[model samples]
Target: ASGLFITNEGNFQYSNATLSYYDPATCEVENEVFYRANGFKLGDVAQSMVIRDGIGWIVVNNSHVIFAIDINTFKEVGRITGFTSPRYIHFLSDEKAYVTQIWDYRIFIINPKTYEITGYIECPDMDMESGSTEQMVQYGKYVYVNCWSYQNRILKIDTETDKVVDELTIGIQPTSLVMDKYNKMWTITDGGYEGSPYGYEAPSLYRIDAETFTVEKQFKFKLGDWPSEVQLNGTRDTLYWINNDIWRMPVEADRVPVRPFLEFRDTKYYGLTVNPNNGEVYVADAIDYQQQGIVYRYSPQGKLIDEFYVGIIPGAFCWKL
Candidate 1:
């Protein structure tokens, strides 16, 4: 409830796979424990997670399951089946959770309370290279996901029916998304590509009209750089996200970013999450091949508040437990 908690993506090494508990008061890692496939447990690739009511739903990509971890004890208490390379998950309510499966092109809905697989929502023509990295906001009683790879589009699903209700084609490799104060859907392009296996060229950032599902305006970004995730500050009316460089885009018409308000060169800014209590911003620093990652905290004025070492390939998610 007090400080920050984050997950490490864990790229196969057992030491790299973990959930870390940090104490800001002392500026130290309070606890670090293996998530799965450890000496005691059997889970893999802790990619993304969201927390609610003191229980953390840890999504394991390699094992294709969701593990319910007791936040207080960090104990693996439960698991749900039918997930393959699920990179991200969003918790809509105490009873419902939505997961984005990468390899299978299917989204799974589950009862978080009992770790039950409620049902599976099928995406037409979804596959390993062509679905979504993360599911976005819920608006008008529906869920929006950033679907890409070959087809850059936003897919809308009716939460009640658990079916694809509509789809809108947008920019190439569109990844992260968040709703503005007015419920307008805004997204950034992860405009990156790959050849064969590991070769990839990064993409750019573009703005889309949430209602029309069309690009209202755009600015050309750099090569080998793309927007990874986005965060909004309702108090200051500002928009912030990460690419090759961390960026700040103002929501106010007169204050909108003419360019990146700030940048941190060479640092891979993967995810951004704001602390609701004090308006502190945190970035997940996936420090490339070294596997050792960093988490940074900044104030509303963009002054560095604090930064600390976490795990290998860290992922940031916020909850007020």
Candidate 2:
């Protein structure tokens, strides 16, 4: 049941986005699954996807919707609405999930069994000028949210009470988060963009203790070279990401920090992921930002394996369990 799902974010604020389905065994892809589905439009700005219990939840960012599809058949089963610029989702259980919205200051509670939004968790630190909440991960009894805009911090939600119990100050724009083999939370901040009202800051990666929910160490980067799409390989000993080219480093202590792991001459990298089962690297190239995007697969050692044409602005990938 292993498959690769890629989300194309289309030209921002546009409705030409799509989903790409690929089979690793055959090296083949079905690029029009969402487009060809019955009575359903793929919507604008496809953000990301997650598969659980044989169901796929496609988060459509600007479209304010989530499409539920049967993983095996690629057929739309249900739809979720009432979101304002939704970004990512984290499943708390088979029947419940939490979805983050880029424009809103809270995470919506989802009842996956009914494909309906039953409630929400309000964020404490939000204003009209509040930025996006990009990605989040659940550990123990809490979900850590990345407040990705002017708020340079991470919000911790108590899963049991569904409340924002604490906030941890990190870099400028914390865009993504991941948990390592040892359960440590790793996050990457893009720093503030140019002309940001909060002033400019350099992008950095922070390693936080899961138990204490405190930042333990940090690795800084140059001001403009923003790093994103943090992922762990099969062994979970190395973390990989993209700045201009692919970069990686040992997650354990006493390592030499991150260095270039893969370099491409012509491709403009956008999204990245390392298959947990095989350690193959998948990179998305949003060429020119207008034309249809391309997804490239590579070996763990940085060798190009194959490339396929996907939707526009294909910036994220998810593995089917």
Candidate 3:
């Protein structure tokens, strides 16, 4: 029953996204499901997905909706609308979760059981003309939001009050967020787009102390090496990411970050993740924007384990809980 859930974020303007289920026990792709199967004509964009309580929640990026499918049967259970350019979803509990939209400053609240939009959290500092929110993480009683505004910062919200409590300065265009073994939060910035209205700068990785709410460690990248994604090992000792190649850094104190753990010899990677169950490294190779992509599995020692073809634009991976 244990497998990897791969999401294909199809073309941004076209409807070609699909979902694949791979059983590692057999090392074969067992099933492939399309948005059409669920009775929804979602061909615009399939952004991200997650599984909870035996149901799959997928955010359709361009369509501005979240589709719920039964994980066990791969059947469309329900769909929730009312979001404008949704990016990611984070489950705070079985009954409650939050979805972040790139176009909107507020995070939509949802009831996972009912697949209904119940409420939303208002970000006080964000506005339509100002910065937009990206990825987020829940630590302790606060949910930290990464804002891609001209003035880059990470805003913390009190989960109980659902109000912006504190904000800490970070790098520009913060893209990814993760937690280490010590429960400290780590986020990496991708600088900014070439024609970004907010402006651009060099990328950086910031380590924030959860207890102190302060930037404990910061690693700035070179001009060309723009860090995009971030993932931690099972033990949370090493942090991994991708710029042009796969790179790693020790999560310890007072150490200079060096070269990449895995070099990009010939393969092209669009997404990066480490399996929490077995520590297997999964890198998505989106060959071209059109055809089917490949997901390369690697060992913890940086050896190629196996590779399989997935849908177009294999953007991310999730473990079936």
Candidate 4:
């Protein structure tokens, strides 16, 4: 096992989501690792997975199950059930973690050890129908959460208190919450466009001072450019995001990079991730959304290394140490 796991977001109506094990050394992938490792099919959407302490916690979205699978074996260790459109999972501490929902306002506190829904953290959104608690990032004692969708605010919480302590308004639909090595918080708004009820607005990337909880700097995108999957490298000194194309910049970049690092138009790039160890950029093409997707791996300097088909709509990644 080379330790690269890609969760394929299966076509909603026809198939359930699946997992793919990618061996970076050989540029090969063994699809259906989850179903093949275990005995049953994964439910609808494989929303996300986070690996910590030898455990791979898989969040299967319409399936309403959070599975604790052996990281190396890819075998089922345990499972937690019940959630409403869960988007992401974040571990607050060894005994605690949280499952954020897209359709529910409460962040259900989860016991990763026991696979139990122990408690919850409640927060208010602009509307009940538009509740989207997407991702979480922690700095020191506080965890910041982005309420994307028809929302424009981010709430900060004290881990000890498990309550909202502060909030800030930004551009429309901030999709990802991440942090840099300097302890600064970074997020990108996936500007509402086309059929959005909130209307279209050029998206903006914001850098915030995590300690003071203030916007340190702001970078704007074109009117039609919607950004998502803001991520940091292993050292947390560089940033990567999706903007109709693959975009990468150092954490200290003064402005948005002038050109796309890797460009493609005819294909839909749904998932974006960078290798922490060697800086290889992995992009998932969820082309057509309902069919098998292709994963492209590129050198850090923008050269294509290899591309291969994995599963349907590969949307997230988890690295092996």
Candidate 5:
């Protein structure tokens, strides 16, 4: 288990999403690790995965199911079904967890031990218009969530009460959210894209105070440039994301870096993730979306380490200890 898992989000119309494993120690990759272990396809759109306490929870988006597997053997421990286009899962404890949805307004509460949905947290007046909750980051007893898709607000949930305690409108569409070591939160705006319902404006990288939930700084990008996949290293001092190319910035910086950390060249960099253990960079080249994608690894200094072919659209990642 000295590697990481990549979720290859297959096609939208088809449910061929798969799980690929990469061992950094040996520089080797195995595609469809789930199918090899279970003899069945890992259901549609593997949106994201989390490995905790020797178990891996794979959230299958369009398939509306979450699969739990033993990290060592990649074998199914159990699965929790019944979801409305689930997006991500955040664990509060070994027994309790929250699952966000892309198609539903309610953030569901589940018992991981029983693999059943015990309750829900309904967001008020959150009707259609990309009213989905994306990535979530926890601080103290509060978890900040991105209402992405075609949305523009960041919601704060009180973990103890399991209620939406606060929210703030940041920009057009906050595609991703992350908090740095300084306890300052950051997010990238998709800009809602031009000609759409929200209309087009330039995208931005916003830094906000975690406790106050107030905007501290806003770094603007051009209209055509929309950033996504904002992430941090294990130490959480640096920031990494994809905006046509791979960009890197330190938490102590006063302005965005002028040059990209790495150029895309002829590649399509879709998802960006940094290894928390060592800050190694992993980028998903989703090719043309219809074909099998490749995962590229680079050193913390932005040098190409290796590349391997994965499933259709390798979009999500989780490091395995």
Candidate 6:
């Protein structure tokens, strides 16, 4: 109840839902899956299961509901409507959950108090059948939504004013975006999809300039590997990402001028996160199907620290309180 960090083990489609727990004191997995077999409701598929304030909000990919689970008791506390193939959920400090309905082409803002949708945002001329990745993020009064223009761009929504304010553009398929403790926006693109106008699927990293409302730098990976997610260690000037493998780049200047730090070869990784308290990088290693996925920890210098077999297909992670 004091504080906790949990992440969806991404293979909710086939396997039972699982969330890993960590102990801040020892910085270890003291006890995980306190109650096993997915604490929430699971239909045909469970898409995104996000944990915030001890409540895990899960999206039933094939259902029109989001199931909330209590992490401590590992019980299904309640459910919310207004979702159709929803992908992810973002919990704002105002206690509002912003969910993106993938097949609906709209963002639904649900009230955490009543489990009712209090507001919604629409995409102009966006086709749900074949549109951009509908991922929404919240920073203070601004809600940023990713859109596919010629390239992927972010639309800023003012929660207080409830209006579209500005647009910040970036590279192709900007699926992941995160705001650091300092409130700077960072994002990565898995290049573009096949058959799309953006060309082959080579990914890139982008640094957004908050003041200018523009992308300050674009770092292209030579491996043509897709950068899935990125996190910055405020304690250290390092930027880590998960692509073909675990890769890190120096984040010295505001611009993207850092060189490659190191790559964890042959370790099929997808989810990468940094624990600022201990200067450790944790990643979910989903080697392949039919194999148990493990979470690996490495130092900022790329030294292997520890590993824990978490689940079947561990895809992403959300670290710290």
Q: Which candidate gets the maximum TM-score versus the true structure? A: 5
Pick by lDDT: which candidate is best?
Answer: 5
Q: How do these models rank on lDDT, best leading?
A: 5, 4, 2, 3, 1, 6
Question: In candidate 2, residue 71 scores what lDDT?
Answer: 84
RMSD for each model, in Å, please?
A: 3.2, 1.6, 2.1, 1.4, 1.2, 3.7
How much is the lDDT of residue 177 in candidate 5? 88
Separate clash counts for every candidate: 2, 0, 1, 0, 0, 1
The lowest-lDDT stretch of 10 consecutive residues in candidate 5 is 122-131
lDDT of 5 at 226: 65
lDDT of 2 by residue, 1-321 (tens): 679999888877668888888888889988867867655668888989988888889998888899889888888988899887788889999888999887777788999898888888888868545656778888888888888877788888899989999998877887788888888888888777788877577888889888888988888889877677788887777888777788888898655344577775566789998898888989899977888888889987878889899988998998984
Alpha-carbon TM-score of each model against the true structure: 0.86, 0.95, 0.92, 0.96, 0.97, 0.80
lDDT tens per residue, model 4, 1-321 = 556899987986555789998888887889999889898888888989999999999888888788888988889999999887788899977889988887777888988887889888887644457777888998888889998878888998888978878889999899998899998889999899888887689999999888888999999988988779899889998998898888888899898887887786777898988888898989999988867899999988888899889888999998987
From the highest TM-score down, the ranking of the candidates is 5, 4, 2, 3, 1, 6
* lDDT per residue as tens, model 6, 1-321: 323344444454554545566654565763336345443335534445666777777676556777777866656787887576676777775467677766565677788767888887765656667544355666667777776423466778777755667876566667677664445566777776557665565667777755556776677765456567676675645677776666675564544434444455676776767876666777777777347677777776768777777655665555435
Cα displacement (angstroms), candidate 6, residue 269, comes to: 1.0
Q: Give the worst 10-residue stretch by lDDT in candidate 3.
A: 31-40
Q: Given candidate 6, what's the lDDT at residue 198? A: 53
What lDDT would candidate 5 get against the real structure?
0.89
In model 5, the Cα lDDT at residue 107 comes to 88
CA-lDDT, candidates in order: 0.69, 0.83, 0.78, 0.86, 0.89, 0.64
Error of 5 at 282 (Å): 1.0
Off by more than 4 A, model 3: 30-32, 35-41, 129-131, 149-151
**Model 6 vs. true fold: TM:** 0.80
